[PDB]
Amino acid sequence: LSPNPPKLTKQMNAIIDTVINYKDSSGRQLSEVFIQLPSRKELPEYYELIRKPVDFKKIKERIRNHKYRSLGDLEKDVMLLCHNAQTFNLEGSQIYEDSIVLQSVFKSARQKI
Numbered sequence: 001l002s003p004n005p006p007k008l009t010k011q012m013n014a015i016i017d018t019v020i021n022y023k024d025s026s027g028r029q030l031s032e033v034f035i036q037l038p039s040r041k042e043l044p045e046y047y048e049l050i051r052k053p054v055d056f057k058k059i060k061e062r063i064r065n066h067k068y069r070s071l072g073d074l075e076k077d078v079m080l081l082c083h084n085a086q087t088f089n090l091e092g093s094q095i096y097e098d099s100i101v102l103q104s105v106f107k108s109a110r111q112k113i
């Protein structure tokens with residue numbers, strides 16, 4: 001019904017940048033694996049298991065192409081990314097544990113703004 005106000009777009013980018021730039025206690029950038037999806041050639045099981053594949057690259061593109069109409073819309077996709085990581089990977093694994101932290105980082109970034 002109307003274009004995204006520049007204020008909303010700036011917020012979406014500010015929230016996602018907080019998530020992407022987040023470095024843990026050891027000083028490790030947790031988002032590293034999630035920026036890009038795995039290769040269809042090396043990990044075909046992933047594409048067999050995961051209904052809606054989404055990475056941080058696609059999220060940035062959807063903010064850019066005004067695909068998210070609200071912060072709740074952006075949240076649904078960030079929650080999807082993490083759910084996907086947790087669906088494919090073993091509980092307790094580095095990827096699995098990282099997605100749980102990034103869910104928390106997003107919520108903390110959103111709740112601030």
Ligand SMILES: COC(=O)c1c(N)[nH]c2ccccc12
Binds near residue numbers: 035036056081084088
């Ligand atoms: C086995 O690796 C994964 O689970 C993921 C990967 N390589 N890139 C992603 C982007 C988003 C969610 C999960 C993943």
Ligand SMILES: [Zn+2]
Binds near residue numbers: 083
């Ligand atoms: Zn599910």
